[PDB]
Design an enzyme around this catalytic site. Structure first.
Site, mmCIF file in Angstrom:
data_model
loop_
_atom_site.group_PDB
_atom_site.id
_atom_site.type_symbol
_atom_site.label_atom_id
_atom_site.label_comp_id
_atom_site.label_asym_id
_atom_site.label_seq_id
_atom_site.Cartn_x
_atom_site.Cartn_y
_atom_site.Cartn_z
ATOM 1 N N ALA A 1 72.966 42.967 -27.127
ATOM 2 C CA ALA A 1 73.945 43.790 -27.832
ATOM 3 C C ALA A 1 75.284 43.997 -27.113
ATOM 4 O O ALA A 1 76.307 44.020 -27.800
ATOM 5 C CB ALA A 1 73.337 45.138 -28.190
ATOM 6 N N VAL B 1 75.574 44.033 -18.272
ATOM 7 C CA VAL B 1 75.370 45.444 -17.890
ATOM 8 C C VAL B 1 74.708 45.490 -16.500
ATOM 9 O O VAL B 1 74.225 44.463 -16.024
ATOM 10 C CB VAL B 1 74.572 46.304 -18.930
ATOM 11 C CG1 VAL B 1 75.170 46.218 -20.329
ATOM 12 C CG2 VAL B 1 73.087 45.952 -18.952
ATOM 13 N N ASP C 1 76.366 43.957 -38.739
ATOM 14 C CA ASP C 1 76.181 42.834 -37.815
ATOM 15 C C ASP C 1 74.756 42.755 -37.257
ATOM 16 O O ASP C 1 74.557 42.435 -36.073
ATOM 17 C CB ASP C 1 77.250 42.853 -36.706
ATOM 18 C CG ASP C 1 77.416 41.595 -35.853
ATOM 19 O OD1 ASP C 1 77.188 40.450 -36.388
ATOM 20 O OD2 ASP C 1 77.850 41.733 -34.687
ATOM 21 N N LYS D 1 76.742 50.341 -18.497
ATOM 22 C CA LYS D 1 77.714 49.431 -19.077
ATOM 23 C C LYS D 1 79.123 49.857 -18.629
ATOM 24 O O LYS D 1 79.499 51.023 -18.779
ATOM 25 C CB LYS D 1 77.603 49.436 -20.615
ATOM 26 C CG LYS D 1 78.685 48.627 -21.365
ATOM 27 C CD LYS D 1 78.583 47.108 -21.135
ATOM 28 C CE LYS D 1 79.777 46.335 -21.657
ATOM 29 N NZ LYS D 1 79.704 44.878 -21.322
ATOM 30 N N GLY E 1 71.652 40.685 -18.187
ATOM 31 C CA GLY E 1 72.103 40.271 -19.504
ATOM 32 C C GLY E 1 71.562 41.215 -20.560
ATOM 33 O O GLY E 1 70.472 41.791 -20.410
ATOM 34 N N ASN E 2 72.334 41.386 -21.632
ATOM 35 C CA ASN E 2 71.982 42.250 -22.756
ATOM 36 C C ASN E 2 72.453 41.597 -24.056
ATOM 37 O O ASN E 2 73.603 41.152 -24.145
ATOM 38 C CB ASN E 2 72.599 43.639 -22.573
ATOM 39 C CG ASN E 2 72.178 44.631 -23.625
ATOM 40 O OD1 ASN E 2 72.724 44.666 -24.743
ATOM 41 N ND2 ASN E 2 71.212 45.467 -23.272
ATOM 42 N N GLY F 1 76.326 42.315 -23.853
ATOM 43 C CA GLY F 1 76.641 41.304 -22.846
ATOM 44 C C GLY F 1 76.161 41.699 -21.465
ATOM 45 O O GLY F 1 75.008 42.085 -21.298
#
Ligand SMILES: C[C@H](NC(=O)n1nc(N)nc1Nc1ccc(Cl)cc1)c1ccccc1
Length: 341
Positions: free
Chosen positions: A13, A17, A130, A32, A10-11, A15
């Site tokens: 920035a 990877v 963001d 990614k 999980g990441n 999702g």
């Protein structure tokens, strides 16, 4: 092969990877996959914008492209893009909202790195738009890196995009600057400084500062602390309904930050107050925030660079078909490998 897959991770920035390692060196990387990257105009434009932005920056507090995999199959068959990035095991969201320590010194160090990366990004005329704890990646060595540049824009945007008119849909509600919520027709790097203030406040109390349930509730929460916005900012409110709603409300005074966060560090609250202002032009910049007494421990102007030349968003304002975007992404991959060797 060049890389060996370890596991799906999980990441914050980007999702999902894959954690991997380069076979010859043993160097750990994140890979990614952008599947069916050229199928939808909006997704394809975002992939191009992100590749260009990340290739332009070379800063320790901004996520770097370590490698991009070349098409191993015919052009027409190239449908998915693989980007090799810095491996980041966590993010500021996971750290803040966990049982991990988060002392004033953790806050001071994380804020410093975030502002260091922003100073460089902002001098390149890039507004992230963001910023939130989840896209501020943190590795095992406590290095913070800004990621997720999909919402990034320059000081100039094309009327052809929906967000140019619908600013209240730009980014994440809990971190979205008043100029975006209210369409105040003043969109600069100051958008990021409101988000920084929200993030700064969140690290101090280990809870979201303005966790609005919807549009109106978001403004209510901001107004509960900041007070009623000035007559000049109310006249600048684009939409009549919002403008009438704000005017219908009884006048309110700002609540001191000493009341919002009881007993919190004085220098922290001083800097926080410089960031969270309704008026974009009244907010402190990333460069000046680095000069605040709160970050003096880490502050070194000789180690806090600017980015030259500035980044140009002209390629993104062009109305390109999915095929033309694929051509530009493929040219970015080629340029990346040509610049290395
Ligand atoms: C948020 C994430 N999207 C995502 O990472 N995207 N989407 C597009 N178009 N491009 C990227 N990423 C990207 C592009 C270039 C570079 Cl250098 C690095 C990353 C997602 C994850 C899982 C499910 C849906 C969405």
């Amino acid at each position: 092969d060049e890389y060996e897959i370890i596991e799906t991770i999980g990441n914050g920035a980007y999702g999902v990877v894959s954690s991997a390692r380069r076979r010859l060196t043993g160097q750990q990387v994140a890979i990614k996959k952008i599947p069916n990257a050229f199928d939808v105009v909006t997704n394809a434009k975002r992939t191009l914008r992100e590749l260009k932005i990340l290739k332009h920056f070379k800063h320790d507090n901004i996520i770097a492209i370590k490698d991009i995999l070349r098409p191993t199959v015919p052009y027409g068959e190239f449908k998915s893009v693989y980007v090799v990035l810095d491996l980041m095991e966590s993010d500021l969201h996971q750290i803040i909202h966990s049982s991990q320590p988060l002392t004033l010194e953790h806050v001071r160090y994380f804020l410093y790195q975030l502002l260091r990366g922003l100073k460089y990004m902002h001098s390149a005329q890039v507004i992230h738009r963001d910023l939130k704890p989840s896209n501020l990646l943190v590795n095992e060595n406590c290095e913070l890196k800004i990621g997720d540049f999909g919402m990034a824009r320059g000081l100039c945007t094309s009327p052809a995009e929906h967000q140019y008119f619908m600013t209240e849909y730009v980014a994440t509600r809990w971190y979205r600057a008043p100029e975006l919520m209210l369409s105040l027709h003043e969109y600069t790097q100051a958008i990021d400084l409101w988000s920084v203030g929200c993030i700064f406040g969140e690290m101090l109390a280990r809870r979201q500062l303005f966790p609005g349930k919807n549009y109106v509730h978001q403004l209510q929460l901001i107004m509960m602390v900041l007070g009623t916005p000035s007559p000049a900012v109310i006249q600048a409110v684009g939409a009549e309904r919002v403008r009438a709603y704000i005017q219908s409300l009884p006048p309110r005074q700002p609540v001191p930050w000493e009341t919002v966060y009881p007993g919190a560090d004085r220098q922290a609250l001083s800097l926080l107050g410089r960031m969270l202002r309704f008026e974009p032009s009244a907010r402190i910049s990333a460069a000046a925030a680095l000069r605040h007494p709160f970050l003096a421990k880490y502050h070194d102007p000789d180690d806090e660079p600017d980015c030259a030349p500035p980044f140009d968003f002209a390629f993104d304002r062009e109305a390109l078909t999915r095929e033309r975007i694929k051509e530009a992404i493929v040219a970015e991959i080629e340029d990346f490998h040509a610049r290395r060797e």
